[PDB]
Design a protein around this ligand. Structure first.
Ligand SMILES: [Ca+2]
Ligand SMILES: [Ca+2]
Ligand SMILES: [Xe]
Length: 274
């Protein structure tokens, strides 16, 4: 009755979970199109909406619900299994129903996370251009001890052309690319000097409104794998700093080729959480 998406063992999240670490008491904010809080395979602890006319506990798009399920779908006898199933999940709506949102709403969501004491921030979103305030917000959250993770982008490769987007391009943010179940780079995965690590982003099965499950493709799918892994690293070593968690993830990654295309490589949660 419960399905295990290929990405959980690929990054070896099942081995840390096996040890008894499943993200308990770690707070993760999913900044996205919201979350269908009523989904039976999810438990949303709280949140905030910075999008006019939509509450935080509803998700008219699906993107937010899918991403959240990858970070924390509940470990039970139904649906799917998240990377960090016992995490404290918070839905921070910064993108509307059409999957777009303003920089100020995004910045407000980042600051909210920061202020409410989140441990991890997932941003499965990107822009061609960043901004002063946005860099300000991610720099302060990082300096404040928050692990900021974002989707690198899905514009692929174009010669030695840097295709990484904002906010993944900022050095205080972990830029995550996408691989498939074969551990090969997804053709849509953005490339460039700032690419830091890779996670499963192709053919990812997760929670989807209403009360169902679906398969999506995107660096948006990869990011939550790293946000979840960071949660597992913290559940095991509550002591680590944001920089140390980050270092653990890129330092222990499985090499797959050139940094321009793969960053340090595919993450390996077992190794990083040693
Ligand atoms: Ca489940
Ligand atoms: Ca970055
Ligand atoms: Xe994205």
């Amino acid at each position: 009755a419960q399905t295990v998406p290929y990405g959980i063992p690929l990054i070896k999240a099942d081995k840390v979970q096996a040890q008894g670490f499943k993200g308990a008491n770690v707070k993760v904010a999913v900044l996205d199109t919201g979350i269908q809080a009523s989904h039976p395979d999810l438990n949303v602890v709280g949140g905030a909406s910075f999008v006019a006319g939509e509450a935080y506990n509803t998700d008219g798009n699906g993107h937010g619900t899918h991403v959240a399920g990858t970070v924390a779908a509940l470990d039970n006898t139904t649906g799917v299994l998240g990377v960090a199933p016992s995490v404290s999940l918070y839905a921070v709506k910064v993108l509307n129903s059409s999957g777009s949102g303003s920089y100020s709403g995004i910045v407000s969501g980042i600051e909210w996370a920061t202020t409410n004491g989140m441990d991890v921030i997932n941003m499965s979103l990107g822009g061609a251009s960043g901004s002063t305030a946005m860099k300000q917000a991610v720099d302060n959250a990082y300096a404040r001890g928050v692990v900021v993770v974002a989707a690198a982008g899905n514009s692929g490769s174009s010669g030695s052309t840097n295709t990484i987007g904002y906010p993944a391009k900022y050095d205080s943010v972990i830029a995550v690319g996408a691989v498939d179940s074969n551990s090969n780079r997804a053709s849509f995965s953005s490339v460039g000097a700032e690419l830091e690590v890779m996670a499963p982003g192709a053919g990812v099965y997760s929670t989807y409104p209403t009360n169902t499950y679906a398969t999506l493709n995107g660096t948006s799918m990869a990011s939550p794998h790293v946000a979840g892994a960071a949660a597992l690293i913290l559940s095991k070593h509550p002591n680590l700093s944001a920089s140390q968690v980050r270092n653990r993830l890129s330092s222990t990654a499985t090499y797959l080729g050139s940094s321009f295309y793969y960053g340090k490589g595919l993450i390996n949660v077992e190794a990083a959480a040693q």
